[PDB]
């Protein structure tokens, strides 16, 4: 359940801060690829018109990152109801060094569980679109290398601002 | 003659899944499904297990959870005997 | 051909056909071919029927029905003819026959086989199993 999930007072600030950090890393990834400035998106000119901060956009420019950043937190609140701030906070948009603190014994299992839940929501979204299909545990190495990059950045975005959600021979 | 298909990785993988998708059908008789199971048994041999891991991926979701199933278990036993001479 | 069957399957098949025939014409519908096979114990699913009418209009006459049972009986008999053909080769019956036993009983079977043909036969293949002998006969 993600649409029928309540958002806390820190979740309203986490939805825009995760969308701002996703735009800041994407503008940092496109600045090295010689992406010029354009009014509309073109693949030939490498134009990007949304090269700005998230606090200077309007309601017509933030709808592509509203539901995608709020459903991931609502699925995280439904898996473990811990949404509070317990630590301090942490175009040429330079993103901060999110690889400062390594993943501990709790964060390494929290990153894989959020990766499996996002794959379960995307597989249900593909099943509802097909009626109107791979598991995360048995996925291929080439597909799991790129799908875990979205889970590692989201856990690095949630680790800032104090919103740290924390829940073969021997067996044979 | 299928030994050494390091040229193309998606054609032999897309063929090996559609034959297994054709191996289970309601409008098929026993004489044709015995050909497809013999065709799938021959093509799981004479090829490297790098491309067979994607079909060993798909069968282990559906065949070992319940005891179509005889040809699938025999192809899995032949692949395991071949590898004896992620995927783990 | 149709001489693979005895008299007594054919008299049984006309017994089943004339029982459920419409007016004595020798006609049945595409339903009645199903009920005439389940009346004798044989219970095929509908794919086994689905190919035989494609192999023969909606009118299934008695020579068409006799040829379909002949192909339905010969395929299992041609798969099982060769094990009982293997039974006089070995004394116990599990499938293990001696190599010294096989050169006087296979040269004397009545197809005018000389000493040379069975000498070619066994060295293009101690005791050998039963499933290898089908592998070496059908080739």
GROMACS .gro file of C-alpha atoms in nm, chain A:
model
  172
    1UNK     CA    1   0.000   0.000   0.000
    2UNK     CA    2   0.145   0.333  -0.115
    3UNK     CA    3  -0.150   0.548  -0.226
    4UNK     CA    4  -0.332   0.491   0.106
    5UNK     CA    5  -0.018   0.569   0.311
    6UNK     CA    6   0.010   0.876   0.534
    7UNK     CA    7   0.302   1.116   0.487
    8UNK     CA    8   0.460   1.279   0.794
    9UNK     CA    9   0.572   1.638   0.843
   10UNK     CA   10   0.925   1.536   0.742
   11UNK     CA   11   0.798   1.351   0.434
   12UNK     CA   12   0.673   1.672   0.272
   13UNK     CA   13   1.024   1.819   0.292
   14UNK     CA   14   1.182   1.488   0.190
   15UNK     CA   15   0.983   1.469  -0.135
   16UNK     CA   16   1.119   1.800  -0.266
   17UNK     CA   17   1.472   1.749  -0.135
   18UNK     CA   18   1.496   1.411  -0.311
   19UNK     CA   19   1.368   1.571  -0.632
   20UNK     CA   20   1.620   1.853  -0.597
   21UNK     CA   21   1.909   1.611  -0.540
   22UNK     CA   22   1.799   1.401  -0.838
   23UNK     CA   23   1.799   1.710  -1.059
   24UNK     CA   24   2.136   1.820  -0.919
   25UNK     CA   25   2.305   1.487  -0.993
   26UNK     CA   26   2.147   1.467  -1.339
   27UNK     CA   27   2.268   1.818  -1.423
   28UNK     CA   28   2.611   1.718  -1.292
   29UNK     CA   29   2.603   1.406  -1.510
   30UNK     CA   30   2.498   1.603  -1.820
   31UNK     CA   31   2.748   1.888  -1.778
   32UNK     CA   32   3.041   1.658  -1.859
   33UNK     CA   33   2.864   1.532  -2.174
   34UNK     CA   34   2.867   1.883  -2.335
   35UNK     CA   35   2.494   1.947  -2.301
   36UNK     CA   36   2.406   2.292  -2.434
   37UNK     CA   37   2.116   2.513  -2.326
   38UNK     CA   38   1.789   2.485  -2.517
   39UNK     CA   39   1.423   2.576  -2.482
   40UNK     CA   40   1.298   2.229  -2.579
   41UNK     CA   41   1.459   1.886  -2.548
   42UNK     CA   42   1.654   1.771  -2.854
   43UNK     CA   43   1.864   1.455  -2.877
   44UNK     CA   44   2.089   1.602  -3.149
   45UNK     CA   45   2.176   1.926  -2.967
   46UNK     CA   46   2.172   1.760  -2.618
   47UNK     CA   47   1.941   2.035  -2.494
   48UNK     CA   48   1.808   2.042  -2.138
   49UNK     CA   49   1.559   2.315  -2.034
   50UNK     CA   50   1.516   2.213  -1.667
   51UNK     CA   51   1.872   2.314  -1.565
   52UNK     CA   52   1.767   2.512  -1.258
   53UNK     CA   53   1.699   2.462  -0.887
   54UNK     CA   54   1.385   2.292  -0.761
   55UNK     CA   55   1.287   2.600  -0.557
   56UNK     CA   56   1.255   2.809  -0.877
   57UNK     CA   57   1.026   2.570  -1.066
   58UNK     CA   58   0.646   2.591  -1.084
   59UNK     CA   59   0.366   2.336  -1.060
   60UNK     CA   60   0.394   2.258  -1.433
   61UNK     CA   61   0.766   2.174  -1.404
   62UNK     CA   62   0.755   1.957  -1.089
   63UNK     CA   63   0.482   1.708  -1.185
   64UNK     CA   64   0.736   1.469  -1.340
   65UNK     CA   65   0.912   1.435  -1.002
   66UNK     CA   66   0.618   1.463  -0.761
   67UNK     CA   67   0.457   1.117  -0.766
   68UNK     CA   68   0.787   0.938  -0.842
   69UNK     CA   69   0.952   1.075  -0.527
   70UNK     CA   70   0.644   1.038  -0.304
   71UNK     CA   71   0.551   0.678  -0.387
   72UNK     CA   72   0.901   0.558  -0.292
   73UNK     CA   73   0.874   0.720   0.051
   74UNK     CA   74   0.518   0.592   0.096
   75UNK     CA   75   0.632   0.238   0.022
   76UNK     CA   76   0.919   0.292   0.266
   77UNK     CA   77   0.681   0.417   0.536
   78UNK     CA   78   0.454   0.116   0.481
   79UNK     CA   79   0.743  -0.131   0.511
   80UNK     CA   80   0.883   0.034   0.827
   81UNK     CA   81   0.696   0.319   0.999
   82UNK     CA   82   0.999   0.530   1.097
   83UNK     CA   83   0.973   0.879   0.942
   84UNK     CA   84   1.150   1.134   1.163
   85UNK     CA   85   1.465   1.347   1.167
   86UNK     CA   86   1.733   1.236   1.415
   87UNK     CA   87   2.045   1.399   1.265
   88UNK     CA   88   2.170   1.715   1.098
   89UNK     CA   89   2.118   1.806   0.735
   90UNK     CA   90   2.366   1.684   0.477
   91UNK     CA   91   2.340   2.585  -1.427
   92UNK     CA   92   2.635   2.429  -1.243
   93UNK     CA   93   2.473   2.217  -0.969
   94UNK     CA   94   2.742   2.046  -0.762
   95UNK     CA   95   2.601   1.756  -0.558
   96UNK     CA   96   2.752   1.684  -0.215
   97UNK     CA   97   2.962   1.378  -0.133
   98UNK     CA   98   2.693   1.124  -0.043
   99UNK     CA   99   2.952   0.843  -0.010
  100UNK     CA  100   3.093   0.970   0.320
  101UNK     CA  101   2.943   0.719   0.564
  102UNK     CA  102   2.942   0.358   0.447
  103UNK     CA  103   2.648   0.120   0.464
  104UNK     CA  104   2.631  -0.058   0.800
  105UNK     CA  105   2.462  -0.385   0.897
  106UNK     CA  106   2.119  -0.218   0.895
  107UNK     CA  107   2.155   0.004   0.588
  108UNK     CA  108   2.275  -0.280   0.362
  109UNK     CA  109   1.955  -0.475   0.428
  110UNK     CA  110   1.745  -0.157   0.404
  111UNK     CA  111   1.885  -0.077   0.058
  112UNK     CA  112   1.809  -0.424  -0.082
  113UNK     CA  113   1.458  -0.428   0.067
  114UNK     CA  114   1.379  -0.090  -0.090
  115UNK     CA  115   1.524  -0.217  -0.418
  116UNK     CA  116   1.303  -0.528  -0.409
  117UNK     CA  117   0.994  -0.325  -0.316
  118UNK     CA  118   1.050  -0.081  -0.602
  119UNK     CA  119   1.093  -0.376  -0.839
  120UNK     CA  120   0.773  -0.528  -0.698
  121UNK     CA  121   0.582  -0.204  -0.757
  122UNK     CA  122   0.725  -0.173  -1.109
  123UNK     CA  123   0.636  -0.534  -1.186
  124UNK     CA  124   0.281  -0.476  -1.065
  125UNK     CA  125   0.270  -0.158  -1.275
  126UNK     CA  126   0.382  -0.360  -1.577
  127UNK     CA  127   0.123  -0.629  -1.499
  128UNK     CA  128  -0.160  -0.375  -1.471
  129UNK     CA  129  -0.049  -0.212  -1.797
  130UNK     CA  130  -0.035  -0.547  -1.977
  131UNK     CA  131  -0.385  -0.653  -1.869
  132UNK     CA  132  -0.546  -0.321  -1.966
  133UNK     CA  133   0.806  -0.975  -1.510
  134UNK     CA  134   1.139  -1.062  -1.346
  135UNK     CA  135   1.201  -1.090  -0.970
  136UNK     CA  136   1.472  -0.885  -0.803
  137UNK     CA  137   1.635  -1.190  -0.643
  138UNK     CA  138   1.672  -1.382  -0.971
  139UNK     CA  139   1.749  -1.081  -1.193
  140UNK     CA  140   2.052  -1.081  -1.423
  141UNK     CA  141   2.384  -0.919  -1.334
  142UNK     CA  142   2.358  -0.661  -1.613
  143UNK     CA  143   2.008  -0.553  -1.506
  144UNK     CA  144   2.088  -0.555  -1.134
  145UNK     CA  145   2.394  -0.334  -1.183
  146UNK     CA  146   2.181  -0.045  -1.314
  147UNK     CA  147   1.869  -0.101  -1.102
  148UNK     CA  148   2.065  -0.088  -0.776
  149UNK     CA  149   2.198   0.256  -0.876
  150UNK     CA  150   1.851   0.402  -0.820
  151UNK     CA  151   1.830   0.232  -0.479
  152UNK     CA  152   2.178   0.345  -0.372
  153UNK     CA  153   2.112   0.710  -0.458
  154UNK     CA  154   1.773   0.709  -0.285
  155UNK     CA  155   1.926   0.561   0.030
  156UNK     CA  156   2.201   0.825   0.006
  157UNK     CA  157   1.934   1.094  -0.027
  158UNK     CA  158   1.735   0.957   0.267
  159UNK     CA  159   2.047   0.931   0.487
  160UNK     CA  160   2.079   1.310   0.484
  161UNK     CA  161   1.845   1.536   0.687
  162UNK     CA  162   1.809   1.273   0.962
  163UNK     CA  163   1.551   1.060   0.777
  164UNK     CA  164   1.740   0.732   0.826
  165UNK     CA  165   1.469   0.465   0.811
  166UNK     CA  166   1.603   0.166   1.006
  167UNK     CA  167   1.388  -0.141   1.067
  168UNK     CA  168   2.532  -2.284   0.111
  169UNK     CA  169   2.697  -2.591   0.262
  170UNK     CA  170   2.605  -2.523   0.625
  171UNK     CA  171   2.234  -2.497   0.546
  172UNK     CA  172   2.250  -2.813   0.336
   0.00000   0.00000   0.00000
